[PDB]
Amino acid sequence: ARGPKKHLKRLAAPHHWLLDKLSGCYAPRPSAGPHKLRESLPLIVFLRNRLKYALNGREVKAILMQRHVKVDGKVRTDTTYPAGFMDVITLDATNENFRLVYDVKGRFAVHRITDEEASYKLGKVKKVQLGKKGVPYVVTHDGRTIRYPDPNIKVNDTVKIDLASGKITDFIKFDAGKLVYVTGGRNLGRIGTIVHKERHDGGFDLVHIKDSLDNTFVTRLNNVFVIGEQGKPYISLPKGKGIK
């Protein structure tokens, strides 16, 4: 091609959306945004295929142009806006707060949360660096830049972000015995505790995770998301608790 693509065939769409192969020839191509194309759920899919509030794309546009949908507390009017893991979707008219978390199947679940839990989200620290004028900042998995972080925050840690202010309330270090959620691979959606982090310099780190049933599995460090201490997650978990 001579430039960026703008279409997406249904057979080429992410499998976890569960799109009918004979419904049409194209799928909603997610727009650029906080989350990657293959790891995002566009708002059209969520509103039409999952919640069934809209019967087609036109009704989704009608809902969005009324400013009824908020994503992490901000009104979004783009049908293909890439909502992703740990995003909070608010529908005030229906009194609904949802958090996007994969289930054991590996698909984003329709998980309803309370307003108090909807007031915050979790972000995996992807980067920590000094910006201009020597101001430290952290970049999270959703692309948020947060300035003046706690000096203890390091990469692979999890920061609790208050959506109203976009500031760090608390954080969890990446360490053995911490509760982790799998966000990639065939173990996508499972929850467990870290047992060991195998280090290979110049290569990909491996993490061993043990679930409550004592089953152990190995995963790349990129696919691991610390969500709390064992027995004390910082977010409500979907049905199944990431077992199997």
């Binding site: 707060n97 998980h111 309803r112 949360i113 309370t114 108090e116 839990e117 015995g177 409550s212 201490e229 064992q230 027995g231 004390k232 997650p233 910082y234 977010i235 409500s236 978990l237 979907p238």
Partner: peptide, 23 residues
Amino acid sequence: FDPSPRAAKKRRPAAKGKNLSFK
């Protein structure tokens, strides 16, 4: 010694089916 927030309560649906007969 073993080292080991609540989800929103589900709601009964607001609306139910309605039946009518005529003729």
